[PDB]
Design a protein around this nucleic acid. Structure first.
Length: 343
RNA sequence: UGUACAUC
């Protein structure tokens, strides 16, 4: 179960081995740790004829190599450097098995490579994508599958992805708090059409408070703040208003408040800063609490850099009476140069 | 001083 060529190769007997030396031994080498790397590296510069010689051998073991820990790299190399015909032939061996492969550690890498290598205009890719219909959430929740779903969204014509949008109906919030689901949701926000992202964004806005405080959900909300439409940033802002001081002190939500300050309009950014700038909450002002907090102090620094003229004047004036008193904290010892750059 | 994203 091991040709002599492979032994001598692994035993460093062939300092100048070449692709054409592997005639008849391609599938064997493709399953070997060093043989796979060797083939990968040689495929890049191989002639059309040499590449075809290789393809002819990988073809008869294609599916097997797709789920092989080393062989999968050889299959991918062909999606990168293969002819359109060789790529369509490999894809055809994927078709019929998309689901199992999507859920497989090495198979999912092959499917992903095919999606970025063949236009979604082709029937193979078109019919491949459709095999996921009826299993969308299963794949989203899978450690391997989720990456295939992300890949379809990034790569395939959005109109054909309506079955993915449909499968998230009613579960956008829940999946936005899921380690993998949050990634797929962001891909959707990036690549889908206005009609498709509409119901997605509606569900997000129905749970903003829970999302901004979630370990994954806060990324989904910042995405909208960073990349979304003004009408969606405004909805998010409306839910943050009346909550700035509170959310500012939260590990996750504090990043969302920073993003509201950065990507909100002039009148919105000031209404958020005013909430803590010219407002009050007992003996001291909201700024007093935020200054010393392990998280809110990052928000304070952000408002300072984004605030209007008359706004920064007040922020520094409420922070003024507590300067020397603000050294003990390991957190506030960074607002130091802060009140020395705009002071 | 503060949070996610997988193979040789």
């Amino acid at each position: 179960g091991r040709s002599r060529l492979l032994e001598d190769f692994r035993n460093n007997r062939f300092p100048n081995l070449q692709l054409r030396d592997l005639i008849g031994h391609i599938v064997e080498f493709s399953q070997d740790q060093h043989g796979s790397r060797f083939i990968q590296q040689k495929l890049e510069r191989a002639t059309p004829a040499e590449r075809q010689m290789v393809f002819n051998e990988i073809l008869q073991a294609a599916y097997q190599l797709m789920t092989d820990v080393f062989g999968n790299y050889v299959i991918q190399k062909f999606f990168e450097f293969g002819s359109l015909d060789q790529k369509l032939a490999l894809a055809t061996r994927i078709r019929g098995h998309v689901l199992p492969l999507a859920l497989q550690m090495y198979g999912c890498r092959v499917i992903q490579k095919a999606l970025e290598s063949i236009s979604s205009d082709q029937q193979v890719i078109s019919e491949m994508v459709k095999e996921l219909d009826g299993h969308v959430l299963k794949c989203v929740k899978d450690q391997n599958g989720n990456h295939v779903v992300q890949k379809c969204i990034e790569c395939v014509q959005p109109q054909s992805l309506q079955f993915i949008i449909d499968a998230f109906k009613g579960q956008v919030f829940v999946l936005s708090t899921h380690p993998y689901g949050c990634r797929v949701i962001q891909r959707i926000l990036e690549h889908c059409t206005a009609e498709q992202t509409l119901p997605i964004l509606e569900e997000l806005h129905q749970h903003t408070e829970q999302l901004v405080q979630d370990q994954y959900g806060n990324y989904v909300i910042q995405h909208v703040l960073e990349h979304g439409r003004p009408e969606d940033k405004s909805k998010i802002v409306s839910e943050i208003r009346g909550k700035v001081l509170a959310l500012s002190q939260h590990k996750f939500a504090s990043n969302v408040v920073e993003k509201c300050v950065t990507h909100a309009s002039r009148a919105e950014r000031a209404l958020l800063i005013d909430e803590v700038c010219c407002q009050n909450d007992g003996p001291h002002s909201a700024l007093y609490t935020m200054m010393k907090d392990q998280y809110a102090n990052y928000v304070v620094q952000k408002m300072i850099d984004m605030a209007e003229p008359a706004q920064r004047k007040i922020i520094m004036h409420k922070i003024r009476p507590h300067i020397t008193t603000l050294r003990k904290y390991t957190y506030g010892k960074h607002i130091l140069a802060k009140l020395e750059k705009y002071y």
